[PDB]
């Protein structure tokens, strides 16, 4: 099965889920960087302006509902929810899978205000789902209709025109329409994470960075690629980007010149232009430009990690490998 993303200014990549019976439908993430599925809930207060604005989960709308209550906070680099667990039928694109979720109660304005989605499905491993609840992957998996014990990300660059998907997710493959050449594989390091080692950041014509190895989290559900704040002031020091609050910028100007930037994965190095990691909307010196590429210290276990997000992901079409824990990439096409 696939399911079609829609992209939000190269940020936020989301498709569509049904929940309940009849179905109510909701935006999601698809992020593998965590392991938990969760949406908005009708228990969620007013109080919590960003409830206000996405789709609810009503139970006492869905005869297919099943309670729990179970308590749990999710944890993201950028935002915290919390909520409680239920089960409910999900529909993923042609996949029906009973599922335990979490109905948030509480979504912060800053972000969740800012998000065009309303929930997340986790394509985590279940090692690292709160609560230990068996995550949705593993759950279609135990159907045993898959074609094969894998899912692929596409992410496609910004349009100003929708008629072009943003873009797409499959489940038990990948799509050759969306990738050239073949796939390089890297294994995981430890199953339980989507993180592979990394073999060397390279600025231009120098590996100035992650000598000596160091992790790199694939994450579909981040903007963009990060890095400890350490390593990103010196890369950033190097771009002669300006560190703001968020962000990083450059004049806008200086965005078309900006240097090569390489990663070391399995042995083949995934290089990236400044069209590919600098958000250039203007050629203006007196305007400031945004970097695709953010400081973010991951904490333990996972972290310190890099983390490479839709940045890297518009790129390169991506697999993700359940049966042989290894990840694949290829030529985004
Ligand atoms: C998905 C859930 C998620 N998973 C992981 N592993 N990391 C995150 N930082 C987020 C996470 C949380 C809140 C967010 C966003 C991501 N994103 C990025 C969406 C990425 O889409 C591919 C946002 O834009 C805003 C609204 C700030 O709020
Ligand atoms: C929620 O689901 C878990 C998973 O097995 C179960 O152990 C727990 O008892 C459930 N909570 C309740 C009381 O429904």
């Known amino acids: 099965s696939s399911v079609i993303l829609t992209n939000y200014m190269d940020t936020q990549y989301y498709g569509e889920i049904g929940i309940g019976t009849p179905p109510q439908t909701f935006k999601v993430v698809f992020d593998t960087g965590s392991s938990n599925v969760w949406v908005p809930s009708s228990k969620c207060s007013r109080l919590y302006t960003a409830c206000v604005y996405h789709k609810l989960f009503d139970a006492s709308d869905s005869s297919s509902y099943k309670h729990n209550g179970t308590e749990l906070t999710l944890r993201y680099s950028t935002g915290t929810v919390s909520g409680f667990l239920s089960q409910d039928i999900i529909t993923v694109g042609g996949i029906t899978v009973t599922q335990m979720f979490g109905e948030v109660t509480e979504m912060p304005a800053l972000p969740f205000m800012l998000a065009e989605f309303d929930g997340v499905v986790g394509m985590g491993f279940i090692e690292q789902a709160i609560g230990r609840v068996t995550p949705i992957f593993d759950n279609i998996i135990s159907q045993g209709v898959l074609k094969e014990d894998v899912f692929s990300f596409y992410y496609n660059r910004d349009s100003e025109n929708s008629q072009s998907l943003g873009g797409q997710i499959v489940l038990g493959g990948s799509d050759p329409q969306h990738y050239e050449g073949n796939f390089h594989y890297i294994n995981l390091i430890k199953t339980g994470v989507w993180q592979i080692q990394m073999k060397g950041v390279s600025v231009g014509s120098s590996t100035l960075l992650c000598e000596d190895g160091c992790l790199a989290l694939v994450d579909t559900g981040a ?111």
């Not at 290089?271 to 590429?293: G, N, W």
Request: aromatic share 12%; proline share 5%.
């Open 223 to 333: 903007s963009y690629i990060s890095g400890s704040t350490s390593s990103i002031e010196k890369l950033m020091e190097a771009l002669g980007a300006k560190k703001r609050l968020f962000d990083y910028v450059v004049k806008c100007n200086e965005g078309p010149t900006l240097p090569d930037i390489s990663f070391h994965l399995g042995g083949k190095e995934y290089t990236l232009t400044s069209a590919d990691y600098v958000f250039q909307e203007s050629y203006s010196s007196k305007k400031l430009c945004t970097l695709a590429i953010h400081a973010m210290d991951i904490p333990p276990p996972t972290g310190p990690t890099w983390a490479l997000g839709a940045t890297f992901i518009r790129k390169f079409y991506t697999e993700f490998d359940r049966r042989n824990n290894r990840i694949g990439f290829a030529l985004a096409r």
